[PDB]
Amino acid sequence: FASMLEDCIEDCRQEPGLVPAVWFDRLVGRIVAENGTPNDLVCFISMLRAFFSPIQKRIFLFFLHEEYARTDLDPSLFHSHAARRELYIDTVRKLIQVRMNNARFREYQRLKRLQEKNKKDRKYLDTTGLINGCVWNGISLQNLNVRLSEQLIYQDALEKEYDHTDRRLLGKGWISGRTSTRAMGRAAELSLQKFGG
Amino acid sequence: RGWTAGAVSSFSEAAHPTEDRPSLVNVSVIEDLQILAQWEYWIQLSLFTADLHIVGGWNLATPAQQQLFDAKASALKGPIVYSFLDL
């Protein structure tokens, strides 16, 4: 609402004064009772884009249900973007950490050489590619994520040189559906809910 | 090398850059009864036979290699199917 751009501070203004409550009463007036200006649509869109909660926006979209009888495009498109940004920030973090640990190894060679020579001397949505996704964007960089994450598994045990499913050996058990992404299987959870405590 | 004994990976891109092969196989022994049992019910399912019972097994893949294959399959956006082939 503050910065905006030129032409009577972008959202169209009027007579000097005109407190923002009755100014917004004008703004909804031009859109419905149509005598408006080309920047008047950018008013109600830029205000709705930052002021409603995600639920309030979803009710606003749902007033259109004659067209688009389908639902839940919003949680689907949010989950693709949440998966994409979470995949992106991990892959860069693994890539930078691989490159510090490897160049730490070259410095580790260098320090053992300089003591060896010395010793011998002494001697909210943001659609990018998640929409219309059929070019298989996931395969390129999730492949890098899997390779780089376990690359750190190698590199960690180089530093140290310098049991999540089959835990019954410990005495815990083998909870069904205990793959690394999940914490409780579907049948195991629903047994905890009603069939026991 | 003193680098443990088969508990890390294979590095499919890094080890066979010109060859398209899964991995080199290991031997091990399946003497865990719960893993031996779940493999038995798999073959019982595939053959409609309540007479087949397992005698033994040999995991020719490290558990770390099984996890690497699982993550590559989800990277391909596709599931994993068990194929029970005769030798």
């Binding site: 050996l169 410990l170 | 004994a5 091990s28 022994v29 003497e31 865990d32």
Partner: peptide, 25 residues
Amino acid sequence: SLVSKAQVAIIDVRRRLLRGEKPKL
């Protein structure tokens, strides 16, 4: 603490028996 340390040794033993790790003949 000795029971906790003895489990760390014994579980590590059981993990090696699952691989098979035959004793020094």
